[PDB]
Design a protein around this nucleic acid. Structure first.
Ligand SMILES: [Zn+2]
Lengths: 121, 134, 454, 126, 171, 102, 74
RNA sequence: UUGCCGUUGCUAUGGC
């Protein structure tokens, strides 16, 4: 067991990154570590994606404890660069969060990814 | 007795057996692409009609090919249009949901009777089926 | 066996549809249409041109004259060139400057001629999407394209404009906005020997223009992510690739129809294929194209794939999995923050977070036997496609280009059996769309020219 | 998921309707039929005249619940476990049980009528 | 379309109340039309289940039905089984119409703002301006629903109210 | 600014003619503007403006494109010979009215 | 000199009751009887409104220590 | 050979 433990393999990683890109287009993604912990303590979050290769790792390992407290799925993508590119911004991000919405046109996709990463976790 | 020239037996029919489930499976397992339109270009009356079905866009492509090929507009011929356009658009808004026709699932027509279960290669001998395999 | 029964019943079905080689084999409608074919005109643009320049193994590779002319522009982004039937080149940067070069002095480095630098002065005084008719670029010029006849260069970027500049003076003759808020252009390609431009805009849109008439022909829709690259030849076909939908489409632009080609490599079946006796996996995002001829093209992916596709097969014909290597893993003094090397090594998880270089530039020489791939591995790769057109293979490398390769294209010289080319490649230290790129390992913002011979 | 009782089974066999296939072409959905232990106790107590009904209720396609109470009053058990949870269709032909079930709200009621099953308080049947 | 069996029971009235209010429908005929053709769809899929495995009808019409249901978009890509066609229902069908989709994509503030945008022609999927609200967008036309370029909520010239107010304030 | 595209250009020596299909492109314009289209056609081809002609115009839904049928002649006299009289009334010079009785 | 007809002879809506502006549109009526219905639903059930908005202020309406609104079994 | 700056060559490199 490493610190960044529940890492996803390549198929789950690309499923995660595709729904991250679609939520970023639909304004349902809060990107960055402290925005992610803000939306996590506010409770509007469906799952959090941490990238398992940033330059420290505890910098985002603070978030699994918060997700565990509030029972939110969390998953580790192995590329901060690809995560930022999926988020649609011109920088690497290390953590992102899918906020809850019921007037959301990708709710089935988000729920399927939640089920996959929760059976992983 | 004697022969008699039969265009109904050397005419290309190919439509008694053209079933949409078999054709859809062939389009799935075709391994060559399918010439689909740029996505807005195939809806018809700002959405007052359907999208258009695959048979309707095939027929439209045939009509525009014949159109450009011999320089003639087709017409508003009354008997054929009062049959075909009105009956076609009413069964289109009946059975075509979102560019896909679901009319076939509501229709009794046996697949394997006409379109499968070969009649010429019926292999009514043990030896003929043995040679057809090997 | 249900799929066996499906294949069997489909075979019987096709046999029955045939039911409903002799000495005489002539068909009346086919020969009548062939009489009309003998009657018609314009066997010029619509050549279904196959690969007629078979010269991959012929020319030299290993001793190219490689000059990396460094320029003082932050993050060069595109390269456009020109040959008539003196040669000029064009570069453009993230510093909002277009720069004209002369390149025809073949044995030496290119020569700067003229700047054209937009800036904050060109921000429109409206913030209104159809009075975007200013005369310069105020944000992030992403692509240039020279005319095949050479009257104009046409460029555009994230300011959702197409500015067409004259060649002889680098002056903006005409401005055409893309009339909506997300309408950033990402790739431009003229169809060859023409005046028709194909721009690929991030609205999932492809705009087409006639430049010498200052008119837009046709807008054509249908990708699912941003159309990251475009490619065209002398035919009125076009080939675009959207980024994350992992499909490449090719467009009959007069018919406004397309052929889609999805990817579809899975590490489950691929690791089973290796398990019959290994760090290779699925696909991120198809990124770059170049139409090699009018029946084949090649795609550069996000997991370092280079794939070769035909016009008659949905799934790709040939793959090449790792094309520029896998990236150097982040150091133990920059992963963890513990004290001991054992825990800082445990924070690498072995091989699980090694990511491959992604091919960010691909150029097929038109109708030829050889294409060039580039990323930030430092070394361009040159590949030739086999003469049966079902595979390609690495010839050699061009290792004098430190940085990301934001653009590759070649410039021809020499006659039908003796040839020499200069491969231009725009080199930056940052990807041409966003930043995202750490470990800038000795990169410089320059133009890597190579002179290859024979 | 549909809770069966004894007169629904008797009327099914008297009208020659299969249980799971009658349920499927009534609702046009996939059904899970449930025999509570009190309905099974009632069918067993019906005697050796109803052997056909008992060994058609003994069917692996018909799943079965485990009621935890004294006595075998299936109407009380069905009413209690349906007004507790509201995730059940009640298939019945008793007039009294039909009136109880259609007086408690949100509970669809299925019944043998004619030569196939009918459903009433389920508002999405077509 | 066709009317239901018992059209006036209170569960059906509260059902239609929730459906018309949650999807901005004008009357009962929207629900009844889309439910009539859904009834045909899953009445067919019931017969495709009542025949057996390796039946030609079941194999070919089953994968045909689930593939064109996936391409309409009411069925996701991974559930390629034929019992999910039975689990399908009416709001899975009228979440696919253009009014619902315009509101979910966020070009409008409610389903009623979406209905008036569609009927005032500010919405175009792909190339063509769609102008009826019950359109049943597909899984490929899901991402090209945007504002029409002929409309002031796109980038076009502003309408008559805005330009008349600008002219009168210029006077 | 209108835009012009010729396709499938064949030659008819029996009718001394060159014929083709005409994709006419008018983004944010109404329609083909047929006399201006004959001008644009007569200048993209050679001069013969009273020998170029178009007849079959169909605009697709939402505007922009329209497909017409273009036929261009050499020799305006033989164009007057070969074209029909109603199209000559529409475009060129001929005008003979029918006798209105019964 | 043209004695034009007027609206009550033209449209002939003889002696109607006062009717509703919300009844003049079939869509707005169901918009406003669904808003009424989902305001009545807050009375019968307790509706999940979306969780804790800001700081937890308190119950804002009272706490009953005698009432138990839970479904007992059998 | 450039935005600066260093080695420079009497041309190539490397730090922002
Ligand atoms: Zn019981």
């Amino acid at each position: 067991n490493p610190k960044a433990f529940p890492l996803a393999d390549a198929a789950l990683t690309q499923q995660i990154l595709d729904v991250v890109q679609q939520a970023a287009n639909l304004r349902q993604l809060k990107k960055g570590a402290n925005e992610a912990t803000k939306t996590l303590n506010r409770g509007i979050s469906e799952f959090i994606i941490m990238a398992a290769d940033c330059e420290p790792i505890e910098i985002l390992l603070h978030l699994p404890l918060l997700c565990e407290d509030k029972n939110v799925p969390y998953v580790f993508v192995p590329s901060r660069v690809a995560l930022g590119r999926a988020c649609g911004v011109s920088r690497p991000v290390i953590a992102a969060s899918i906020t809850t919405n019921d007037a959301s046109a990708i709710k089935t996709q988000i729920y399927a990814v939640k089920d996959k990463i929760e059976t992983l976790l | 007795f004697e022969d008699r020239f039969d265009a109904r037996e050397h005419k290309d029919r190919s439509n008694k057996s053209r079933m949409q489930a078999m054709e859809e499976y062939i389009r799935e397992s075709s391994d060559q692409p399918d010439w689909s339109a740029s996505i807005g270009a195939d809806i018809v009356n700002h959405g007052r009609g359907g999208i258009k079905s695959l048979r309707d866009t095939e027929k439209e492509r045939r009509v525009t090919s014949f159109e450009e090929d011999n320089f003639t507009r087709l017409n508003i011929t009354n008997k054929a249009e009062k049959r075909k356009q009105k009956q076609r658009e009413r069964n289109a808004r009946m059975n075509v949901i979102g560019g896909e026709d679901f009319g076939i699932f509501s229709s009794k027509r046996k697949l394997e009777d006409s379109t499968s279960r070969r009649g010429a290669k019926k292999t009514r001998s043990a030896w003929d089926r043995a040679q057809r395999r090997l | 066996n249900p799929a066996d029964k499906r294949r069997r019943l489909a075979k019987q079905y096709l046999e029955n549809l045939k039911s409903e080689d002799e000495y005489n084999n002539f068909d009346a409608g086919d020969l009548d249409k062939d009489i009309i074919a003998s009657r018609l005109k314009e066997d010029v643009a619509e050549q279904q041109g196959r690969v007629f320049r078979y010269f991959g193994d012929k020319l030299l590779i290993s001793e190219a004259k490689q000059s990396f002319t460094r320029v003082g522009e932050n993050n060069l982004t595109c390269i456009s060139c020109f040959q008539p039937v003196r040669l000029f080149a064009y570069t453009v940067s993230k510093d909002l400057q277009l720069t004209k070069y002369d390149i025809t002095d073949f044995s030496k480095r290119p020569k700067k001629l003229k700047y054209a630098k937009g800036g904050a002065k060109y921000i429109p005084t409206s913030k209104h999407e159809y009075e975007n008719t200013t005369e310069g670029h105020y944000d992030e010029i992403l692509t240039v394209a020279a005319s095949p006849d050479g009257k104009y260069v046409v460029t555009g970027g994230r300011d959702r404009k197409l500015i067409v500049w004259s060649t002889e003076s680098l002056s903006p003759v005409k401005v055409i906005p893309t009339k909506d808020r997300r309408g950033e252009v990402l790739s431009l390609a003229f169809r060859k020997n023409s005046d028709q431009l194909y721009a690929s805009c991030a609205d999932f849109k492809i705009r087409t223009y006639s430049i010498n008439q200052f008119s837009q022909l046709e807008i054509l829709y249908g990708h699912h992510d941003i159309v990251e690259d475009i490619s065209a030849l002398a035919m009125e076909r076009c080939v675009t690739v959207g980024a994350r939908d992992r499909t490449a489409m090719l467009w009959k632009i007069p018919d406004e129809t397309r052929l889609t080609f999805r990817g579809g490599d899975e590490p489950q079946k691929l690791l089973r294929r290796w398990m019959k006796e290994p760090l290779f996996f699925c696909e991120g995002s198809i990124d770059v194209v170049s139409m090699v001829d009018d029946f084949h093209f090649i795609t550069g992916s996000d997991n370092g794939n280079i794939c070769l596709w035909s016009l008659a097969k949905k799934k790709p014909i040939f793959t090449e999995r790792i094309a520029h290597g896998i990236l150097p893993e982040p150091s133990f003094n920059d992963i963890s923050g513990e004290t001991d090397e054992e825990l800082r090594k445990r924070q690498l998880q072995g091989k699980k977070l090694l990511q491959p270089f992604w091919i960010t530039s691909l150029y097929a020489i038109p109708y030829s036997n050889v294409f060039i791939s580039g990323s930030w591995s430092g070394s361009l790769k040159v590949w030739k496609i086999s003469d049966n057109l079902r595979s390609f293979e690495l010839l050699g490398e061009l290792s004098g280009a430190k940085g990301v390769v934001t653009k590759i294209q070649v410039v021809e010289s020499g006659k039908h059996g003796k040839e020499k080319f200069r491969i231009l490649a725009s080199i930056a230290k940052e990807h041409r769309l966003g930043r995202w790129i750490a470990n800038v390992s000795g990169a410089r913002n320059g133009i890597y020219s190579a002179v290859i011979d024979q | 998921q549909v809770l069966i009782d004894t007169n629904f089974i008797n009327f099914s066999i008297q009208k020659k309707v299969d249980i799971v296939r009658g349920m499927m072409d009534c609702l046009l959905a996939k059904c899970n039929p449930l025999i509570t232990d009190c309905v099974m106790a009632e069918l067993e107590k019906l005697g050796p005249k109803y052997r056909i009904a008992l060994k058609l209720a003994r069917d692996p396609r018909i799943k079965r619940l485990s009621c935890s109470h004294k006595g075998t009053y299936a109407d009380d058990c069905l009413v209690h476990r349906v007004l507790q949870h509201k995730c059940y269709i009640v298939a019945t032909n008793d007039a009294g049980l039909k009136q109880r079930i259609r007086k408690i709200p949100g509970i669809p009621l299925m019944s043998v009528g004619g030569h196939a099953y009918v459903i009433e308080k389920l508002p999405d049947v077509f | 379309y066709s009317t239901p069996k018992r059209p006036y029971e209170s569960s059906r009235l509260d059902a239609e109340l929730k459906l018309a209010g949650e999807f901005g429908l004008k009357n009962k005929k929207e629900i009844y039309r889309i439910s009539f053709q859904l009834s045909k769809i899953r009445r067919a899929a019931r017969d495709l289940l009542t025949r057996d495995e390796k039946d030609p009808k079941r194999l070919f019409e089953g994968n045909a039905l689930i593939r064109r249901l996936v391409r309409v978009g009411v069925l996701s890509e991974d559930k390629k089984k034929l019992d999910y066609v039975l689990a399908l229902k009416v709001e899975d069908f009228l979440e696919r119409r253009l009014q619902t989709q315009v509101y979910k994509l966020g070009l409008a503030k409610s389903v009623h703002h979406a209905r008036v945008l569609i009927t005032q022609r500010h919405i175009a999927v792909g190339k063509q301006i769609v102008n009826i609200p019950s359109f049943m967008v597909r899984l490929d036309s899901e991402k090209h629903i945007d504002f029409a370029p002929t409309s002031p909520f796109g980038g076009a010239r502003p309408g008559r109210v805005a330009r008349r107010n600008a002219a009168r304030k210029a006077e | 600014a209108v835009t012009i595209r010729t396709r499938k250009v064949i030659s008819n020596p029996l009718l001394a003619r060159k014929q083709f299909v005409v994709d006419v492109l008018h983004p944010n314009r109404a329609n083909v503007s047929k006399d201006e289209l004959r001008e644009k056609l007569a200048e993209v081809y050679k001069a013969e403006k009273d020998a170029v002609s178009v007849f079959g115009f169909r605009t697709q839904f939402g505007g922009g494109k329209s497909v017409g049928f273009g036929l261009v002649y050499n020799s305006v006299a033989e164009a007057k010979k070969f074209e029909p009289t109603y199209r000559l009334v529409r475009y060129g010079l001929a005008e003979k009215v029918e006798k209105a009785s019964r | 000199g043209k004695r034009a007809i007027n609206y009550q002879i033209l449209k002939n809506k003889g002696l109607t009751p006062k009717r509703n502006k919300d009844n003049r549109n079939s869509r707005v009526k169901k918009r406003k009887k669904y808003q009424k219905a989902q305001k009545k639903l807050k009375s019968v059930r307790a509706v999940y409104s979306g969780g804790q908005s800001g700081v937890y202020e308190g119950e804002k309406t009272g706490i009953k220590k005698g009432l138990t609104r839970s479904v007992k079994f059998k």
